[PDB]
Amino acid sequence: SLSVAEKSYLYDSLASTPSIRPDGRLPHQFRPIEIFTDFLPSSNGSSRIIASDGSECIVSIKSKVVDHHVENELLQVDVDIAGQRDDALVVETITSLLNKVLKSGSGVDSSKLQLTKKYSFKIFVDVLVISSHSHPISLISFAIYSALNSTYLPKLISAFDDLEVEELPTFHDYDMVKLDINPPLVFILAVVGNNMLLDPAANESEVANNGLIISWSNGKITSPIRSVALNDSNVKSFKPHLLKQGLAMVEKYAPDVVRSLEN
Amino acid sequence: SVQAEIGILDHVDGSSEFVSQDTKVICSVTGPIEPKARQELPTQLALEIIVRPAKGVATTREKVLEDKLRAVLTPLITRHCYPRQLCQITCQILESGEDEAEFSLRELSCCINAAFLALVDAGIALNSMCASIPIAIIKDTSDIIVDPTAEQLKISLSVHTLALEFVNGGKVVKNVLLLDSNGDFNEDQLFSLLELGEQKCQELVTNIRRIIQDNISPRLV
Amino acid sequence: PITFPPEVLARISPELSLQRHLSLGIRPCLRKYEEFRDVAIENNTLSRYADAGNIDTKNNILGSNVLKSGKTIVITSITGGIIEETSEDIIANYASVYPVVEVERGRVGACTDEEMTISQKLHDSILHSRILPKKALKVKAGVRSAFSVLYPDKRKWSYVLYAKIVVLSRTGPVFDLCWNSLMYALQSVKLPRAFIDRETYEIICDQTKSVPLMINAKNIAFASNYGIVELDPECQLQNTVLIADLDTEAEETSIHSTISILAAPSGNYKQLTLMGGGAKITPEMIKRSLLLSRVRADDLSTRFN
Amino acid sequence: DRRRLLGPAAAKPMAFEQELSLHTGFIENCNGSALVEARSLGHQTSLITAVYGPRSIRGSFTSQGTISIQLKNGLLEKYNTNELKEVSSFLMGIFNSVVNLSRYPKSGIDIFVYLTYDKDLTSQISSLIPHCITSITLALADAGIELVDMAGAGEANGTVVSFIKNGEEIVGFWKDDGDDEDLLECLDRCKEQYNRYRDLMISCLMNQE
Amino acid sequence: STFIFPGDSFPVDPTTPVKLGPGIYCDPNTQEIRPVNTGVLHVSVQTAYIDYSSKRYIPSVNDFVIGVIIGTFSDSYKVSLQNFSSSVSLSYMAFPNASKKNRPTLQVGDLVYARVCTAEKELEAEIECFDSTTGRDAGFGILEDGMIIDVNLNFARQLLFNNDFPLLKVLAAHTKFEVAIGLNGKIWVKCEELSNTLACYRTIMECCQKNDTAAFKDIAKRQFKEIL
Amino acid sequence: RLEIYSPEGLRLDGRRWNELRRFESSINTHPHAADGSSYMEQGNNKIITLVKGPKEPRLKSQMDTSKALLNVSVNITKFSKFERSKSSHKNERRVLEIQTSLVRMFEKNVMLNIYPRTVIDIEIHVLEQDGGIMGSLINGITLALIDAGISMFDYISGISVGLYDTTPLLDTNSLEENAMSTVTLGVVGKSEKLSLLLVEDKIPLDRLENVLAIGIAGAHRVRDLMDEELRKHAQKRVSNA
Amino acid sequence: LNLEESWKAIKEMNHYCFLDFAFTNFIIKDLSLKKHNNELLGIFVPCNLPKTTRKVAIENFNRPSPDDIIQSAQLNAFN
Amino acid sequence: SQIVTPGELVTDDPIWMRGHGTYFLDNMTYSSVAGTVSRVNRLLSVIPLKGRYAPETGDHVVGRIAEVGNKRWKVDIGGKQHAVLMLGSVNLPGGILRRSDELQMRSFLKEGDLLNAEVQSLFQDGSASLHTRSLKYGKLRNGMFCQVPSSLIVRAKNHTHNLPGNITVVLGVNGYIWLRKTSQMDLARDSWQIYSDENDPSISNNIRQAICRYANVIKALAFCEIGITQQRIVSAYEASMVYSNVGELIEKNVMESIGSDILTAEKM
Amino acid sequence: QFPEIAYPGKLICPQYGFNYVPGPGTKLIQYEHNGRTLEAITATLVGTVRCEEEKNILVSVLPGTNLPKEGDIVLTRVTRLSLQRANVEILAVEDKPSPIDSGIGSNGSGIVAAGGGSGAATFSVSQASSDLGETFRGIIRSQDVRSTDRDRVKVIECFKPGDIVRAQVLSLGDGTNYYLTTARNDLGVVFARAANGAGGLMYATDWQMMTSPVTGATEKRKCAKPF
């Protein structure tokens, strides 16, 4: 909650040439984060992200063996946000977007989940947001990206061709195989006048004119793209040249973010 | 005949219990009391009516019974004597006396009689007296049966419920509060059914007057 | 002079508005005392068998009806199911339909009293009218073998019917409209043919072949309602009356003595409801209502195709 | 279910360019309404929308109005809850930019859309978005709610774009699947559809007085 | 004198003017006098009323009641006379010799003895802790300690107004006690020892459960022998 | 068919009959999200507890002029066991029972009468679960409440004891809880008085006192560990700041 | 912009082309009160009211209300 | 002093008088919190290690308007309860009794506004009563808001300071901080427009940069848990001129370096 | 020249030509045409354009060829009385019913309040604004009943529950109630019934009296002036 004078001051600062952010960041600069992985021994993979303003997210990865003819989608995401109802609009919108970005053909290599000519692994992604102060789409995306690159799966040791004669799948009791799937990343941008901002803060979201959601995968922009309202009292229309600017910005500065999440 | 008892519960304003053949209903009344803000009416009394079945949980079958009970009870009560107050009325069915999968008229009549007795016991201002009977018409014979049994309902062609209003010592009919007919019938059958039902209701209301006077008189000086 | 619009007057003093209108020989709905509303329908346009030559393959609707009366619109659609049946004029030999009613009035939530009571009463009146015999829902299943299906010119199965009714632009009680729309929709239902391939037997519906639904056509009835008002001497502008087809806000708020009838064109009656919470109800008014309902049912039965 | 009649528990369900017409103000118990009906070679759609408000709202004092949008199926249940709610959120984002919400303190506006009819005469929910926008605009104008401009939309190869100010501004952008390098063509095609829809909407408002 | 039912003929000459008491209604539309309650009709410048059985109290002017303080406001108390009923109000200036410096010192949970002074149909009823009609202050105020007994309204009326009701006399033959009687269905008693108060409570409850006033003495003797 | 208690006096994980599992706790883990917080590890259990308040009530209906209102919320995740849960646990009767039991336990210990017209909210997240979860919940709530600087009379410690034929086993895990009946206790301070007693399966009447005594001694040891951790954290906090 | 330029821009930007469905046809289809107004929609006056009583009622409201008298005297105090 | 935990015996001498943070049974005194033992004459009490801000008479606080009520306002100051601001405790531009202003209270203060106030008195349960009856108090404008824990605000006699670069800071006792451009009143320290929502139309870029840097160094001081004073604020601002970009001050190592340099310079 | 008819998004006039000021149904919007900034007044409603002089000119769009606000005239029903104030519910805002649908018949038979049925306990609070049949609420304080002697007003001698009262809005109040006044000759009771709503209608006789026609009984009200 901000007053009229605060909002006017902040908007005058942000919508200037050059733009002035309240903490002095550059238009493309991110804030520091802390990453932990592999701290839930009962899961195939896990991660925890802590933001500088107190935001925190926890991700768990679990698997199951299914018949990949009856089963159509091998990736499923479930989202829980503390303080919100299970049928809240924002929760279901985020769930839908995250299931769309990890669909079968999106840049996610689902051929690595196949065991035997009949069966496959199905991956369950569980997300729990402990504390948040703005739209937590990119934080959840970063946590999912971190957790999926440190996941291990059971190793099959019982035949591969079972079209004619089928045997129950059987797995080695100690060894596991690292999953080398290619996960995407999701970015959120803010529109303040004629400027574009990367990784906006809570107070910057209260004065923004509009927002954009852009997906990224292995060097290219990916299909799920949306316009989103970050507030309800200042949302307005924008000219078409700001969309191209945002796409170019994501294309230019995405590779640096990838190197920050390595290991 | 029928058996009725008055004043059997301890933590309500009024209560009763009505038995007719194999149908058994117990009812309670609490009011006038303070209502919720969303139930309040500026100039008259508000009602809250609940009906519970003998088996299972309450469903849409009980909602129709609540609607009909509310229709019958609203003109009976002198509602303008209790502005913005509430009266709670609850009926529990203990034994249906019929096949609940097909028929519900005996329960409706028993609930009407029990609710009237509980309203008398509580001390609520009433405009007049009431009585209710079930009626059926049997196949082949085409005879009109007052107070049918459960076996006669299984071979019936139409089933009816009649509730009347009596004044002046229980001898003058003031209005027809409810008539509910379902089946197949013509006009002559209807006008014979009404004529028989009026006499049966008069006998029932005389019996009810005797029971009430027997129960209430020892409580006064 | 100080004057209010008719809607405002109906909102702030409905009884006075009703009394003033009646003394002039009219009604606040602008009709005569014994005048009904006109009815127009459109049968079987949303079903999968609507086009006899081109059968829709993504549609699971077996019968349909659209009804318009005054400003109110009713849409009815019927679907089906199948159940395995393990284990005269008597009511034990008859079936019914399971309806769900929605009245659009700007509310989100669970069902209201109106919707629940209307659904239950539709189910009960279908059962009591002896319209749908149980033997009319028995499945004569075929067998498919190497692939073709042979029908007979073990286990047992029965059909189950469901109904969905949507009411738009409501201005008054809507039970009669829903009943009449459902009556129109039932006479156009086609049942798909079914065949078969601890045991697991799966029954499958035929893609294009179907058979008609056989109902007792002499037991079909139509609905109407009436109201009774007592005149107030001090409110008449410069004795009791009978009113048909109640509508608008002023009439529904002020009238507490009503009559409901289901009448068949054969000559008998299937339903009758009397509720006297206002003016006294006399035998003459009952007879008049019966005659009017007979005329209305005769009109509604022989009006289309 | 204690509030519905759903039948026996053991039963199983049976297993087996565009020309427009626009009309407003035909529902009695609401504030505004519209009917949109579009036909082409290989598709046919009908839609109904209704507006309730401005009305009282529960809670504390608010200085501007609040908008709620509800999408419902019709006849056939072709969509599940999650996608309908996502489309509702997108529409609410669009219409928070065109309604003059500062004019309606401590009040709410509720909008209902019914998906009556949709038949294939010869990626499926995206092509339905423009007609929803047209219907909501028409119903809001019919109900007398203040709008800064008339909002329309167009669809081209899985991309939906909504315009105001004669196509010089964007109030909504949606993209699923499709080609990654096709952005200018989509914008041009969507704007071309938007201009025709805007002409038809203005004609409908001006003629039916 | 006679037993009457709602809807019965009213046996009073229409010419003679009779003041109407409880249980009798005057129709606002037809101006007709009819009974609405079941019971015994008593006709006494003559007054007619019906005596009927009841348990739920409705406030009436000049009644003696016992209340519980349930809330304190800036200028008055909030008082309950019966569970689940609408509350009444007791003003800070409704005490003897009251002024803006001589404030009352009652708390939430205290018992009070008061008189109903205002019972308008469109408003909330008011009570006072002194008889304003006569200027008398006879027992009104706080009741310390003791025990409270719930009874029906006819029993409370019989205790308060009938001097031939034998309960107080038979109770006084066993112990010395203090008593306050409220027409809302409350009785307050207190003795010097707790056992005597308990015996009085049990005797009053059992006597109210019965209808025969000739068995009161045996009940009292048995109950006072029980406590040893 | 496994050796729950071997003839040599050893359990399946290598413990003896009167030994606790590994006990680790942390305090002030979420400074930016709550007034008080804790992180509890008991064997393979992992729980996060947050305490918010005392603060202004959200609604004017939930206001009391004589004391504060206390609320407890428990969230059990779908990934807390080896097998993923099919549906949510938010509105189960078991969870509501747990929440009511915790509220009624801690109503008598917290001095709610010195914070009138306020509300205190407790939110709990269970990440991993390996038997004896109720005692862990009790210990986490105690630690988080003390970390928030809220007045109370004493500690409350939770413990679980299983009865295997004639042998009592202290602080059972999931394998033992699926093969025998268990008892859960809540002990106040260093006394013999119980705040909670929970028996859900059959136990012979003439074998309950011994189980109670064993559990009471175990809870005293648990209280000692919690007190030591709290004192160490306080010493570190005051040494430099 | 100049006034003439602004007006030309206004005129140019305001341009638009001003120009058999079964469902639409089905849904979108197609004196006593006029002479009886001011009585059907007026305030309540009893039917059988003598002209004397009506005149007395009308005459009362043509005299100052209680607020009018008090406001008249207060003018001299607060100028 | 001595660290105690809840339920611990403090003393058994029947000579002490008990204060806050303790309970007793006969002659035995116990602790109800974790904290330190304090003695004042014959009074014995325990001071908690952690807790929320507790208002005191005469405090200078910064708060936000929460509710608009009946002749009163509700103000959030970060305590256990909301504070109360009566309509008679503020200054009205026109007057109090003109032959309104009770139904038009939102024309002066409404939900979300920030203001400067002083604690007038405490109620029975500890809740505060505020007043704004001086020219140095009122609506806040022309700057930015930041927050630090109240335990890091060192008690002093003055709480408004003028900083180099034409910047003024208002240090709230409850921990709420306001940074703004220096005005004429601030310079002089060393009618209808007092409720205006408009900012100064002549705020330059240098002032905005300076405010950003001051906010960053205040957050850096709070990160190292160093008490905030005017001298420390100025010293940290001057020592951060090594970095030309304000945005580099948000990294952890830079914040720790600034704090350690401040402490080392003070200790020398 | 000014346009004659308007629709949402239609430009009307520039700011100067005289300084133009947007009124009801209009707005001021920034436009960029041919690379130059433009200011104009834009219509927000369908209707006709009229301008009145208040130099400064106010431009407004009037529907044809709502939400209560300060200065509006409303028709209300009395719900509760006390010694300090009266509680009412708003039924119509400037001869237009509010809401359009009152919810009659939604709770079944009998005489039920709008929120007194089964649907009141299952309303989705987080997916809508309010339930079926809900209305705006207002409060009339005793000091606002009249303009003179506003310290000796007896509420029960002015209004009764169930009366229809014409009032004027003073303030928006809180989120629950508006604030209303009747301190004018044309404001007060317009419809009333004898015996506290159980009898027949009464007619106004004097500034402070109403009369029952069937039986010549009189009661005290604060009568709004007829004719």
| Residue E210, token pair as written in the block | 């019965």
Q: Give helix B105-122 / helix B187-216 axis angle, nearest 10°.
A: 30
Q: What single letter denotes the amino acid at residue B201?
A: C
Chains B and G touch (3+ CB pairs under 8 A): no
Q: Is the four-CA dihedral F133, F135, F139, F142 of positive or negative sign?
A: positive
Question: What is the distance between the alpha carbons of residues C233 and C240, in angstroms, rounded to a whole number?
Answer: 12
- CA H5, chain centre distance (Å): 29
Please name the member of I25, I42, I130 whose beta carbon is closest to the beta carbon of D108: I130
Residues 6+ away with beta carbon under 8 Å from C112: C103, I106, I107, I117, I118, I119, I132
Question: What is the distance between the alpha carbons of residues H236 and B111, in angstroms, rounded to a whole number?
Answer: 84
Phi, psi dihedral angles at C178 (to 5 degrees): -65, -45
Nearest chain C residue to I111 by CA distance is C253
Which DSSP state fits A29?
A: P
Please name the member of D2, D4, D5 whose beta carbon is closest to the beta carbon of B58: D2
Per domain, the residue ranges of chain F are 1-241
* Interface contact C71, partner D, CB < 8 A: yes
Integer-rounded Cα Rg, in Å, for chain B is: 18
How many Å lie between the alpha carbon of G35 and the closest alpha carbon of chain D?
27
How many Å lie between the alpha carbon of F131 and the closest alpha carbon of chain A?
14
Q: Which residues pair with H228 in a beta bridge?
A: H153
In B, which residues are within 8 Å of C290 by CB distance? 187
Residues 6+ away with beta carbon under 8 Å from D160: D126, D129, D130, D153, D154, D172, D173, D174, D175, D190
Q: Is the four-CA dihedral C246, C252, C257, C258 of positive or negative sign?
A: positive
Whose CA is closest to D50, among D146, D148, D132? D132
- CA I14, chain centre distance (Å): 34
Determine whether the interchain pair B177/C120 forms a contact, defined as Cβ–Cβ distance below 8 Å: no
Q: Do residues C149 and C206 touch, judged by C-beta distance below 8 A?
A: yes
Residues 6+ away with beta carbon under 8 Å from B218: E211
How many Å lie between the alpha carbon of I48 and the closest alpha carbon of chain H?
33
Q: What single letter denotes the amino acid at residue F7?
A: P
Of the options 1.10.150.120, 3.30.230.70, 2.130.10.10, 1.10.1030.10, the CATH number for the domain spanning B1-221:
3.30.230.70
In A, which residues are within 8 Å of H252 by CB distance? 32
Per domain, the residue ranges of chain E are 1-54, 55-145, 146-228
Strands E2-4 and D169-175: unpaired
Integer-rounded Cα Rg, in Å, for chain I is: 23
Residues 6+ away with beta carbon under 8 Å from B111: B25, B27, B51, B65, B69, B91, B93
Beta strands in chain F (DSSP E): 23-27, 36-42, 45-55, 69-76, 119-128, 156-164, 167-170, 181-188, 194-199
Chains C and D touch (3+ CB pairs under 8 A): yes
* Interface contact D27, partner C, CB < 8 A: yes
Can you tell me whether residue D128 is helix, strand or coil? helix
Question: What is the distance between the alpha carbons of residues F48 and F136, in angstroms, rounded to a whole number?
Answer: 11
Phi, psi dihedral angles at D116 (to 5 degrees): -65, -50
Whose CA is closest to F178, among F82, F50, F71, F69? F82
Question: What is the distance between the alpha carbons of residues H184 and H204, in angstroms, rounded to a whole number?
Answer: 17
Whose CA is closest to I76, among I173, I217, I214, I191? I191
In D, which residues are within 8 Å of A188 by CB distance? none
Nearest chain G residue to C69 by CA distance is G27
* Residue corresponding to tokens 């041009």: D188
Question: What is the distance between the alpha carbons of residues C61 and C50, in angstroms, rounded to a whole number?
Answer: 10
Torsion of CA C122, C126, C127, C131, to 10 degrees: 180
Beta strands in A68-198 (DSSP E): 75-81, 114-115, 119-131, 152-156, 171-178, 185-192, 195-198
Phi-psi region of E193 (alpha: psi -120 to 50; beta: other; left: phi over 0): beta
Determine whether the interchain pair H197/A5 forms a contact, defined as Cβ–Cβ distance below 8 Å: yes
Can you tell me whether residue H255 is helix, strand or coil? helix
Q: Is the four-CA dihedral F72, F76, F77, F78 of positive or negative sign?
A: negative
* Residue corresponding to tokens 């009293």: C113
Determine whether the interchain pair G19/D206 forms a contact, defined as Cβ–Cβ distance below 8 Å: no
Which DSSP state fits B217?
A: G
Nearest chain B residue to D2 by CA distance is B59
Please name the member of I65, I127, I135 whose beta carbon is closest to the beta carbon of D68: I127
Can you tell me whether residue A263 is helix, strand or coil? coil
How many Å lie between the alpha carbon of C99 and the closest alpha carbon of chain D?
7
Determine whether the interchain pair A24/H247 forms a contact, defined as Cβ–Cβ distance below 8 Å: yes
Question: What is the distance between the alpha carbons of residues F20 and I153, in angstroms, rounded to a whole number?
Answer: 77
Per domain, the residue ranges of chain B are 1-221
Q: Is the four-CA dihedral G60, G61, G63, G65 of positive or negative sign?
A: positive
Q: Which residues pair with C157 in a beta bridge?
A: C84
Chains A and E touch (3+ CB pairs under 8 A): no
Question: What is the distance between the alpha carbons of residues B172 and B189, in angstroms, rounded to a whole number?
Answer: 23
| Residue H266, token pair as written in the block | 């003070």
In A, which residues are within 8 Å of F75 by CB distance? 80, 82
User: Residue E15 CB: number of other CB atoms within 10 A?
Assistant: 5
* Interface contact A32, partner H, CB < 8 A: yes
Which DSSP state fits F85?
A: P
Determine whether the interchain pair A124/F30 forms a contact, defined as Cβ–Cβ distance below 8 Å: no
Alpha helices in D1-128 (DSSP H): 81-95
Question: What is the distance between the alpha carbons of residues A210 and A228, in angstroms, rounded to a whole number?
Answer: 6
Chain A residues with at least one Cβ partner in F under 8 Å: 40-43, 53-54, 56, 58, 60, 62, 64, 78, 80, 82, 86, 124, 126, 128, 130-131
In E, which residues are within 8 Å of B80 by CB distance? 28
Please name the member of I101, I108, I127 whose beta carbon is closest to the beta carbon of C117: I108
In A, which residues are within 8 Å of H251 by CB distance? 32
Q: Which residues pair with F120 in a beta bridge?
A: F70
User: What resolution in Å is listed for this PDB structure?
Assistant: 2.5
Question: What is the distance between the alpha carbons of residues F226 and F216, in angstroms, rounded to a whole number?
Answer: 15
Provide CATH code, domain E1-54.
Answer: 2.40.50.100
Residue of G21, G26, G61 to mutate for C, most C C-beta atoms under 10 A:
G26
Can you tell me whether residue I52 is helix, strand or coil? strand
How many Å lie between the alpha carbon of D154 and the closest alpha carbon of chain I?
19
Of the options 3.40.50.300, 2.40.50.140, 3.40.50.720, 1.10.3720.10, the CATH number for the domain spanning E55-145:
2.40.50.140
Nearest chain B residue to E87 by CA distance is B34
* Interface contact D64, partner A, CB < 8 A: yes
In F, which residues are within 8 Å of A122 by CB distance? none
Question: Can you give the length of chain B in residues?
Answer: 221
Provide CATH code, domain E146-228.
Answer: 3.30.1370.10
Domains E1-54 and E55-145 share a fold: yes
In C, which residues are within 8 Å of G46 by CB distance? 234
How many Å lie between the alpha carbon of E35 and the closest alpha carbon of chain I?
17
How many Å lie between the alpha carbon of D60 and the closest alpha carbon of chain H?
9
Whose CA is closest to A204, among A231, A185, A228? A231
Q: Do residues D122 and A132 touch, judged by C-beta distance below 8 A?
A: no
Peptide bond into F168 cis (omega under 30): no
Question: What is the distance between the alpha carbons of residues B144 and B156, in angstroms, rounded to a whole number?
Answer: 10
Whose CA is closest to D164, among D151, D173, D153? D151
Question: What is the distance between the alpha carbons of residues I73 and I92, in angstroms, rounded to a whole number?
Answer: 9
Chain breaks in chain H (C to N over 2.5 A) after: 99, 190
Q: What single letter denotes the amino acid at residue A127?
A: V
Q: Do residues A107 and F59 touch, judged by C-beta distance below 8 A?
A: no
| Residue E155, token pair as written in the block | 């029993």
Whose CA is closest to B22, among B132, B147, B195, B120? B147
Query: HEC profile for C182-244?
Result: HHHHHCCCEEEEEEECCCCCCEEEEEEEEEECCCCHHHCCEEEEEEEEECCHHHCCCCEEEEE
Integer-rounded Cα Rg, in Å, for chain D is: 18
Question: What is the distance between the alpha carbons of residues I67 and A115, in angstroms, rounded to a whole number?
Answer: 65
Whose CA is closest to G44, among I163, I173, H187? I163
Question: What is the distance between the alpha carbons of residues D164 and D191, in angstroms, rounded to a whole number?
Answer: 10
Provide CATH code, domain F1-241.
Answer: 3.30.230.70
* Interface contact F84, partner A, CB < 8 A: yes
H or E stretch at H167: strand H167-171
CB hemisphere CA count around C20 (13 angstroms): 24
Integer-rounded Cα Rg, in Å, for chain C is: 23
Nearest chain A residue to F29 by CA distance is A54
Determine whether the interchain pair A58/F33 forms a contact, defined as Cβ–Cβ distance below 8 Å: no
Question: Can you spell out the DSSP letters for chain E?
Answer: -EEE-TTPPP-S-SSS--EE-TTEEE-TTT--EEE-S-EEEEE---EEEEE----S----TT-EEEEEEEEE-SSEEEEESSTTSPPEEEETT-STT--SSS-----TT-EEEEEEEE--TTS--EEESS-TTT---SS-EEE-S-EEEE--HHHHHHHHH-TT--HHHHHHTT---EEEEETTTEEEEE-SSHHHHHHHHHHHHHHHH---GGGHHHHHHHHHHHT-
User: From which experimental method does this structure derive?
Assistant: cryo-EM
Chains B and E touch (3+ CB pairs under 8 A): yes
* Interface contact D58, partner B, CB < 8 A: no
Peptide bond into A18 cis (omega under 30): yes
Question: What is the distance between the alpha carbons of residues I163 and I217, in angstroms, rounded to a whole number?
Answer: 18
Question: Can you spell out the DSSP letters for C233-296?
Answer: GGG----EEEEES--HHHHHHH--EEEEEEE-TTS-EEEEEEEESSS---HHHHHHHHHHHHHH
In C, which residues are within 8 Å of B176 by CB distance? 274, 276, 281
Please name the member of A100, A223, A227 whose beta carbon is closest to the beta carbon of D172: A227
Class of domain C1-305: alpha beta
Question: What is the distance between the alpha carbons of residues A76 and F79, in angstroms, rounded to a whole number?
Answer: 14
* Interface contact E123, partner I, CB < 8 A: yes
Q: What are the CA-CA distances from residue A247 to residues A209, C209, D153 (Å)? A: 18, 55, 22
Q: Which residues pair with C273 in a beta bridge?
A: B180, C260
* Interface contact D106, partner G, CB < 8 A: no
Q: Do residues E153 and E185 touch, judged by C-beta distance below 8 A?
A: yes
Question: What is the distance between the alpha carbons of residues B92 and D191, in angstroms, rounded to a whole number?
Answer: 67
CB hemisphere CA count around H117 (13 angstroms): 31
H or E stretch at F93: helix F93-107
